Amino acid sequence: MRWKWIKKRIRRLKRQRKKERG
Amino acid sequence: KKYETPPHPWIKERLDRERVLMDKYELKNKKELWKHETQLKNFRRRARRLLAARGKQAEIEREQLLARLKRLGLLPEDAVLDDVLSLTIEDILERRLQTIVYKKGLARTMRQARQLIVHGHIEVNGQIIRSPSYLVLKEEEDTITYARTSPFANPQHPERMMIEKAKQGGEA
Amino acid sequence: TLLDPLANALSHITNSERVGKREVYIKPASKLIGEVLRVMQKYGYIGEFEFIDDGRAGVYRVQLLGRINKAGAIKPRFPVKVSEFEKWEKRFLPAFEFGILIVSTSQGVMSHKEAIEKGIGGRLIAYVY
Amino acid sequence: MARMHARKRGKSGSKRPPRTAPPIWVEYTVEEIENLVVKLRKEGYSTAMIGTILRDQYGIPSVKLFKDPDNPNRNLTITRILEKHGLAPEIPEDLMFLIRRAVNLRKHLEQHPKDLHSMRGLQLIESKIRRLVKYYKRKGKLPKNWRYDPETAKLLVR
Amino acid sequence: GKKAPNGEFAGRKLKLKRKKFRWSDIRYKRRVLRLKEKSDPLEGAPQARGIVLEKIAVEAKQPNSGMRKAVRVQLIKNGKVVTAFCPGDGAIKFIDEHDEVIIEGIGGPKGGSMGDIPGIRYKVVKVNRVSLKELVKGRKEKPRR
Amino acid sequence: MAKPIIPMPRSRFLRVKCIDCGNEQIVFSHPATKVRCLICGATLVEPTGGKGIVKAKILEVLE
RNA sequence: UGGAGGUGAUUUAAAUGC
RNA sequence: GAGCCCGGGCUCCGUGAGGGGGGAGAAGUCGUAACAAGGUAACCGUAGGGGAACCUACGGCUCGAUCACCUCCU
RNA sequence: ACCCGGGUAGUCCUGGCUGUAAAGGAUGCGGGCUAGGUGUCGGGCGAGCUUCGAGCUCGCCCGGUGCCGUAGGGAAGCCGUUAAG
RNA sequence: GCCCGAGUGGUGGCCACUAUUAUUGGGCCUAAAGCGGCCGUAGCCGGGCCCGUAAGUCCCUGGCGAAAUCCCACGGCUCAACCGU
RNA sequence: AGGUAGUUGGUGGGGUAACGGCCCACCAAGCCGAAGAUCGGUACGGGCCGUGAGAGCGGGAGCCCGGAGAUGGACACUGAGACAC
C-alpha cells in the first residue's frame, strides 16, 4: 500500500508538475 | 407558552397514566391534562428553588407561593415547601370547575357537567362561565348555584330528576 | 519544581487515607497546610498532628481517624462572591450536610459552614469531606 | 529531592546536619573563626572549599550557626565575612566558576572541531550562565548594561 | 495537567484554544463561513420554482433496481441545472414539459440523497402551482396546459 | 533513609590525637580531603569513598 | 511454570471463482 | 468642489473548447499484491526500475514469521 | 523476481547541503503521594572469607537498568514506585 | 387499530440530545490524536518565615445600568391570553 | 505580518458654535504592530429574542431605544435647527 501510494502521489506530482513547469 | 410533552411522546408508561386519567376526569383533549401538569411543574420548580437559596433572601417570596396554594385549596394547613412537591396531576384535576360541579351534587356525573356550564346552566358568583378548566378557589366553592337557569326556575325540569337518581359527589 | 505545596500535602493525605495507613508524613510544610490542618482538626476530620521544624523544613505527622473521604485544593483558586457560594456549594461538596468548602477570608480561614455563619467570602483555597 | 537536568538520573541525597544551634564541644571565638577564613582566602582557595577545609580540619559544619548571633541582621558566613573586609570578588563565585570553565572549552573546540558532544555542552553551560546572569542583574551583583557573549566571557577571565 | 492552563490571567489562551478547535466541526465551520449557503444552489432557500427542461429516468443504487421518476428543471434566478426526484407512483404523467415546477430538498441538506437515489438532493412538490400529492388523488384538482 | 521522618546524616565527631606531635584535632568522621596537622604538616586522614580512610595508627576518642 | 533475543532455515504443495 | 470622461494597471461577477480527481456501477482483461510464513515474512523512510498489482537496494521496526539450535527470567 | 554469475552509482575519507522514519516504550516534560518480590549494573556502609585486591559472599541504603505482581486503572491485551494509579 | 386533534404532516434553518468542542464537563500505548530530542524568549504557573501597602479579593454604604419582555403577588376584562398595581 | 507621509508629535496660526493635523506655515521623526496591528470577509448596534437543568450556544423579527439612508453621486440657500423622503 503506502509504497504504492507514495510513488503514485510522487508520479502524479511530477508528471503534473512537469505539465506546470511546462 | 402553556404545555409540555415529555422527550418521547409515544412512551407506554406515560400514555397509560393519561388514558386512565382521561376517562376518570372526562377530559375532551390531552392538552387539558397537560395544562395542569405544566402548572403543577411551575409551582414545584419555584417552591424547590426558594427553599434551596440562602434563608435571608426576602422570605416574602415563599410566603407568597404558600398563600396562593392555600387560597386555591391544594394546600390545607401544612407549613413546608416540601408538601407542595407532594402534590400530583390528580390533585390539580380535583380542583377544576368540572370536578367541583359533580362533587357538590349540582350534576349527576362529570360527563353531564360538561354539558351544563357551556349552555350556562351553572352560575358562579354572579357570573356564568364557559371554560370548564376554571380554577375554583376554596372561598369560591361556596358560591355555585342557579338563578335564571333551566335546571332551577321551577320544580318539574327533568334535570332535577337526573341529578337526584345518583346523588354521589367526591373525587372525579 | 513543586507548586501548590498545600495540594501536594492534601493529595497525599487523601491517597494516604484511601490505603488506610495509620498516620502520615508530609515533608514540605507551611502555614497554608498548617492552618488548613488546623481548621480541619477544628471541624474534627483528623486526629492530632505534630510538626517538627527541621532546619530543612517543617514536617507534619498526622493522625488518621478514618473520617475523610475526599479533600482537595482548587486549581486556579477562583474568587467566589457570597451569593455564588450556593453554586459552588452544589458542585464540589457531596451534600448540604458537610460544608467544608475551605475558602480563605477577610476574617481569617474558615470552612464553608464557618464562613456562612459569619457572612464574608473570597477566593477558594481547598475542600474537605 | 532530584532534578534530572540534562539527565534522567536522580540527584545525590547528600543532607545537612539538622543542628540549628552549634556544637559547644567544638570551641571558637568570633575573632578566631574570622582569622581562619581570611587565611584561607589569602591562599587562593574559594568559599565552598574554604567551608570544606574548615569542616574537615576545625570541625565547624557551616559558619552561620556558629557565628550568628554576633550582629543578628542575618547569618554571618564566609563571604559575608569576606565583604566586610573587601576580600570578596564582585562577581559571585557561582557565576565565576561557571564562566571560568567555559573559556577552556572554547579552546578545545578551536583546535578539534568535529565534536558533537563537546560542542553540545558549550550550549549546555552558556545557558546556565545566561540564567545566572539574568537574575543577578535584578538582584544586583552585575550591572544592567551588561549582556553575555563569548568575547565578553574572554575579557572577564583575563 | 490535563490540558488547560489554569491560572487567573491565562484565560485568553483558553479563549483562543476553543475557537481554534471549534473549526474541526465541519458543520460549524461550514455555517460560520456559509458554505452551506453558497454551494448547493437555492441561495439557501426553503424552495425554488423552475422550468421543466425535460423528463429523465435514472437507475437505482446497489442492492436495488427501479426507475425513479426524475425531472430536469432549471431554477429561474438561480439559473442552475438541477436533476430531481419526483414523489408518487404514476406522477411523471401529470408533469408536462415546460410547466413551472417548484423544488425543495429531501432528507437533510448535507448532500444526502436518500438511500436508494444516488444524486438527487431535491424534491418536487408542484405542477402549475398545484402539487403532486394533490394529483395522486383524483378528486382534488387535475392539471392544465 | 529518613527524608520525611527527619533526615539526619550518618555523621558524628571524633577527637583525633596526633602520634607525631600529640596535637589534638577535631575531625569529621568523613574526611573529604586531606586534613593536615597544624604542628606537624602530616596527613591524619586521606579522602576515598564514604568515610575518609585514616592513614596508619592515630589515636582516637569517639564523640 | 510462563516471557525475550542471536540464525538455520523448508521448496517436495500451482492462478481464479459471480 | 460631485458626477462625468480618457489612457493604463490590478481584481471580481455571468459564461467556455479542453482538462483532474472523488464516491460508484460491479458480467469483460490482465496478474496474484496483501490477509495463513499468502507459498520470496510484513511494514517502514529514502532511491531506481517495471504495463499493473509490484520488484529490488540500503537503513530501521515488529504491529515477525514456524519448528529447530543456542542464550537469559519468576 | 525470489535462486545463481558479472556490475555502476553508493557504501569509506574530507568539507558542505539536505532533515526524513514503525526517529517506539506507537507512552512530552517537572514535582508530590500510593503492597511488594526478585535479578542485574555502578556508588556507600556493617561483617565473614582472603590470593590481603572489595577478590568471594550476606544485608541495609542511594542512583540506574529488567522481569513478576497488591490496591487501583483499563474495553480488553495489559499497566501497576521506570504508572497507563 | 394507535396517536393527536382544527389541526396534522413535508422540505429547509437554529438549539437540544452531542462531556461530537469538554468552564461546569472529553481525550491522545494499541481505537483519532505526543512534536524524532533539546533549549530558552513572550506567556502562564511558584517552598517557608516577618513587616508595609490594600492593586486583585471579600464586606458595607452610596451614585447608576429607561420602559417593555421574564418571575411572584394582588386587582381588571365571563375565563385566560392581555392589561393595571 | 509588517503598516503608516497630515502620517505621530511640537510651535505658531486659520477656520469653525466650539476642542482638535479639523486645515495650514515652520520644525521634529515619531506613531501603530505577535496582549495580532494592517488587510480581507461578514455584519446596523442595544433592550431583548430562541433554545438549553445549568453553564452555554445561536439570533437582531414586530415593539421600544440610538445611529444611518431617501434612484446612484455631489452641492448650497432659507431658517434655532436641513445640506432637506
Side-chain angles (χ1 to χ4, degrees), chain C residues 52-66:
Chain C
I52 292 79
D53 191 43
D54 208 52
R56 303 209 69 162
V59 51
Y60 279 68
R61 168 195 193 172
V62 187
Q63 187 177 353
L64 291 188
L65 192 162

Side-chain angles (χ1 to χ4, degrees), chain D residues 82-144:
Chain D
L82 299 174
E83 173 170 298
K84 198 181 185 186
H85 313 149
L87 302 162
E90 180 147 18
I91 188 164
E93 189 48 57
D94 310 70
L95 201 58
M96 182 129 166
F97 260 144
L98 284 165
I99 286 176
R100 172 54 145 80
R101 285 196 275 179
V103 177
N104 306 291
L105 290 179
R106 286 209 175 82
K107 288 178 290 160
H108 174 81
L109 273 183
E110 184 189 302
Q111 299 153 283
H112 288 291
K114 191 190 156 196
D115 260 282
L116 198 59
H117 220 135
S118 239
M119 195 183 257
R120 188 256 184 179
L122 184 75
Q123 186 82 235
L124 194 61
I125 197 157
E126 175 185 349
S127 114
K128 199 169 271 193
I129 292 157
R130 265 316 295 159
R131 318 215 305 236
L132 277 274
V133 167
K134 187 184 189 183
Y135 179 75
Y136 284 133
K137 287 187 175 187
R138 310 307 191 249
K139 196 156 161 139
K141 301 198 175 189
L142 178 72
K144 297 190 169 196

Side-chain angles (χ1 to χ4, degrees), chain B residues 2 15 19 29-31 34 46 64 68 71 127-131 134:
Chain B
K2 222 197 204 178
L15 285 165
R19 296 162 175 179
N29 298 77
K30 288 285 194 81
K31 57 183 269 163
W34 304 336
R46 197 173 183 264
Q64 277 196 169
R68 191 81 182 161
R71 184 168 188 177
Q127 311 170 351
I128 308 307
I129 68 308
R130 67 178 189 176
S131 179
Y134 199 42

Side-chain angles (χ1 to χ4, degrees), chain A residues 7-18:
Chain A
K7 293 167 183 184
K8 285 180 183 173
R9 290 163 190 169
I10 288 160
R11 282 171 177 179
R12 280 180 174 174
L13 291 162
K14 283 190 171 198
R15 289 176 176 185
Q16 292 181 358
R17 287 173 173 205
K18 285 173 182 191

